[PDB]
Amino acid sequence: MNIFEMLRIDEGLRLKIYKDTEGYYTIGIGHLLTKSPSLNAAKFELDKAIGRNTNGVITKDEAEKLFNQDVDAAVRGILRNAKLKPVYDSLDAVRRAALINMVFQMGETGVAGFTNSLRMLQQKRWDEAAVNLAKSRWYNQTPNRAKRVITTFRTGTWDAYK
C-alpha cells in the first residue's frame, strides 16, 4: 500500500467527467477540471490538459498521467509550505501518505488551517490529533474518507484501507 493505492481507493477511477463531493467537474482519479457550473468549461479545460479533443472521455493512461502529476503537486505544496513542511518531515512513511491525502483533497491552504491538529501530529500525539481531526468540518462533510485518514494517522498502519 502507498499514497497511489490509497488515493485510487479514496477517489476512485472515472473515465468520464463527474462531480466531486463539492459538486465540481472532475475526472480520472480526482483531477479537478473547473469550479465553473459549465460542463463545456469542464470539457474545454480537459482538452487543454490532455492536448486533444476528448469530448469528455479519456484513457486509463491519460488518467494515470494526471494522477501522477497531481500527486507530485501535492507534495510540492507540502514542501513549499512552512506550516506543512515540518510536520511532513516528522511523520513516518505511512503517516506522510495521510497528510498527502489531505493536501490532495483540500489543497495546501485548507490543510494549513488545521493549526491544532497539525501541531499534535508534530508532537506525535496520535490519539489527541484523531479526536481533534474528528470535530472538523472536513469530518462532518466527508466522514467516510476522513475516518480512514484519521485511522491512518492514529495507527500508522494501512488497516483502514484493507
Swiss-Prot record:
Substrate binds at residues 32, 104, 117, 132. The keyword Hydrolase applies. Changing residue 26 to H: Facilitates transglycosylation more effectively than hydrolysis; covalently bound substrate. Its EC number is 3.2.1.17. Induction: Expressed late in the viral replication. GO terms for molecular function: lysozyme activity. It is an enzyme of class 3 (hydrolase). It is found in: Host cytoplasm. Pfam families: Phage_lysozyme. The active site is at residues 11, 20. CDD domains: T4-like_lys. One of its GO terms (biological process) is peptidoglycan catabolic process. Changing residue 30 to A: Almost complete loss of enzymatic activity. Optimum pH is 7.3. One of its GO terms (cellular component) is host cell cytoplasm. Endolysin with lysozyme activity that degrades host peptidoglycans and participates with the holin and spanin proteins in the sequential events which lead to the programmed host cell lysis releasing the mature viral particles. Once the holin has permeabilized the host cell membrane, the endolysin can reach the periplasm and break down the peptidoglycan layer. PANTHER family: T4-TYPE LYSOZYME 1-RELATED. This is Endolysin.
